[PDB]
Symmetry: C2
Subunit: 487 residues, 2 copies
């Protein structure tokens, strides 16, 4: 199974033969060893992307579209192999690989295939005698560093828009979850993407990541990741002042009010925090329940949590799976420990499961911690199936809590009050806000953060705006121009 | 003459009482001393803007528009005052301040006063039963650092879009040319802008600049200035990962092809680099002449250059004034010297005016140097009344030269060939390209750089895009879905 760098249309090892173990979260066993790209490997990748940019950006929006469409179809056709591949590598329940990751990946690529030739410039109302027309051109060679929570689906998200616009791409998945991205670029050539238009360069953040965020021929750096590394992606941009897209995490408020449909809210909250083992920046990791329904909500929710079938990602019966790296587990258990010493009161989970089939894997039980908005764990992104419950009394207390964070990515609330719904959505500082639903994403719906959760948008024309440049051309047609210096 | 900081509707001295000398470029005499702001004052400023934001962003677009519209008018009413104030301080010919600066400043504030209630969100086609609307909200408190080349006009360029979209602003003009900006904000409160909506905070760059770029409560920093100091706006932005806009200079190609209208081209070229003493990033500082018309061209151009009325900026018949700072002067002369040490051949200019009369001012003669493209004055932005001349024989030659630079702000060419015109405009890596005209700017025509000339755009819907955020709201109304966890 593809485990090499993919540069200029070929799978190749790292120039220096570096390697990285790719392990399966189930058991911690080795899946394969992947070629680890380093600074040298990305020069090769970037030069290939640079080499390829002209025939590609000059390719005809529609033929970049037709290829992206072709890719979506191919992904679907290969949907069980990817799913399998992505679950095995990620820990995603394959019921999640099949029904979420793969379709969402295809859907996104299909969206941007039909976007490619809908990317339009404008013609400006300027002075008489002049024609001002502004193209939207590709930036050029764009770099993209993706995290490991949605390796497969985030290829769409990142690569969808960039390719549609005609940029060439050097993309760096995490050493953690590479495999499924690598297969995707092979699907890409399978379907006719020209060599070098996309190059995949898995490697450590400090080697491949850094070469990319600082490479002088990269015009944009797209980065989804930890705030900390994102400041570092920002400092690295200094190099040539490439444009930046950062998505840097969320601490998703999930508010439930007095008149919420609590069966629906419960289901939504469960999905919102436990889907993908909570490894989603838009996860509803902060339950915020109105004191007058808290107990009723919590009766069904904790039940729900406690009943989730944690286990082998390859079982079409598994509802949850392991975290993706052993490090993150620890991290998610330290957070648990710290939610506990902070006076937190575990209602479910709290620690790694007990089953013997799960003892090698990076599993953590669907935890649920009652706390105070103040607690750490209520302020920092625990990237795991870990929600905090806090309770409120006034719309205003809820807004306060929701907005009591440095994050701004996702949000959600549950009511039936027309006013309240909009008054809160309008007032929450997040880039998105779902009401009576959660973690709802569409390829046309701008997805991104606000404040310290980042800037830039994936999805929709916005994503395309982020991957193009305005190139205004003036034509002096019948213009009367007195010399500035009269004769 | 207002010479204090403007914070919270108040002219006030710097906390530390630090002060800067503001000098006439003509005779280097003291016009006044300005309150030098530093970190303390930019916190008072940013704080005032933060306080002001909520009520301002809630103003309802028409009402911020109405205020921007009143400002334009008011600016036009105080046109000679502003014109005189800006010339005195900057070195601009008052015929420039009154015919260019002032009118372009109002034009742009007008444009954006009517742009205010035309800033629209979108409704996305999402799955059935969902309503997805995406508002465009203001970022919040916006920091803006402007250079000294168009103090007045750049107030409109930066503050126009930002205000329209409902941000509040802390603007920092240069210690070198604050006076115009200061009168503008009074012009603002004069007209009804609420206190703290705009705060002006002139100060050195490493003081008030640094502090603006690093501020935690600033959501975006817009910078026009050198490439050097831009990397350190970028390096500062990490603090809170505020969005950035950069315009970092130009080395404007002005290509003249064999079938150009050489009288027109000469006037354009003269305007392109000698207007504003060449202190314009979109200056046509690199004349690229087709070998067949280069002699015909240079004949009329060098006679022009030498005919140019260098002198007292307050003379409306002055054609060119001094550079606005003694340092600029010194640097431009250095460039001249190095232009020549390099084998450059000065065809006009090459030093300060032999006019005992212009001896105290920072004057430099309209300078024209025959050079190579490899030369440094041909690669580096001089930022004075200085054009280098190079010759070519092919379109492809001309393109190569035009693009043989790190810059990519403006560009321009002269022909009557249809193809050529577009082929070249489409092939020049610049944000803007003028054909048979140059330095043509309109409030609706996106203005900005590409590559290391930066990113972001001023003017137009684009400028508005750069000062808003996507706020995606999802409402579940009529179509629900099945638990992720089926019981």
């Amino acid at each position: 199974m593809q485990n090499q760098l993919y540069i200029d249309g070929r799978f190749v090892d790292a120039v220096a033969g570096g390697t990285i173990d790719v392990v399966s979260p189930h058991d911690g066993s080795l899946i394969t060893r992947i070629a680890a790209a380093e600074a040298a490997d990305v020069d090769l990748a970037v030069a290939a992307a640079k080499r390829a940019f002209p025939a590609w950006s000059a390719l005809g929006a529609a033929e970049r579209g037709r290829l992206l469409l072709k890719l979506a179809d191919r992904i679907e056709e290969c949907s069980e192999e990817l799913a399998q591949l992505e679950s095995l590598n990620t820990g995603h329940p394959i019921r999640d690989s099949r029904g979420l990751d793969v379709p969402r990946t295809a859907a996104c690529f299909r969206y941007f295939g039909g976007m490619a030739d809908k990317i339009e410039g404008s013609v400006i109302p300027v002075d008489a005698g002049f024609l001002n027309y502004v193209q939207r051109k590709p930036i050029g060679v764009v770099a993209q560093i993706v995290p490991w929570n949605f390796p497969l689906m985030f290829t769409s998200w990142k690569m969808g828009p960039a390719l549609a616009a005609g940029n060439t791409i050097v993309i760096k998945p995490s050493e953690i979850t590479p495999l499924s991205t690598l297969r995707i670029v092979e699907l890409m050539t399978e379907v006719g993407f020209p060599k070098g238009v996309v190059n995949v360069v898995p490697g450590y953040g400090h080697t491949a990541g850094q070469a990319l965020a600082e490479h002088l021929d990269v015009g944009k750096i797209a980065f989804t990741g930890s705030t900390a590394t994102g400041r570092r992606i920002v400092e690295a941009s200094k190099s040539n002042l490439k444009r930046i897209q950062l998505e840097l995490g969320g601490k998703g408020a999930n508010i439930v009010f007095e008149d919420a449909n609590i069966e629906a809210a419960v289901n939504g909250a469960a999905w919102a925090i436990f889907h993908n083992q909570g490894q989603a920046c838009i996860a509803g990791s902060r339950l915020i329940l109105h004191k007058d329904i808290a107990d009723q909500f919590l009766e069904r929710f904790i039940a729900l949590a406690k009943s989730i079938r944690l286990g082998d990602p390859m079982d079409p019966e598994t509802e949850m799976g392991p975290l993706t790296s052993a490090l993150r587990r620890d991290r998610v258990l330290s957070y648990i420990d710290i939610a506990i010493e902070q006076g937190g009161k575990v209602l479910a989970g709290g620690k790694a499961p007990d089953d013997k089939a799960l003892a090698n894997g990076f599993y953590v039980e669907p935890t649920v911690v009652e706390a105070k908005p103040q607690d750490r764990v209520c302020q920092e992104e625990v990237f795991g199936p870990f929600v905090t419950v806090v309770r409120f009394s006034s719309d205003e207390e809820a807004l306060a809590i929701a907005n009591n964070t440095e994050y701004g990515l996702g949000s959600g609330l549950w009511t039936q009050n027309l006013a309240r719904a909009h008054k809160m959505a309008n007032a929450i500082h997040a880039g998105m806000c779902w009401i009576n639903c959660y973690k709802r994403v569409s390829p046309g719906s701008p997805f991104g953060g606000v404040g310290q959760s980042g800037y830039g948008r994936e999805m929709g024309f916005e994503a395309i705006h982020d991957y193009t440049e305005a190139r205004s051309v003036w034509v002096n047609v019948d213009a009367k121009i007195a010399p500035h210096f009269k004769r």
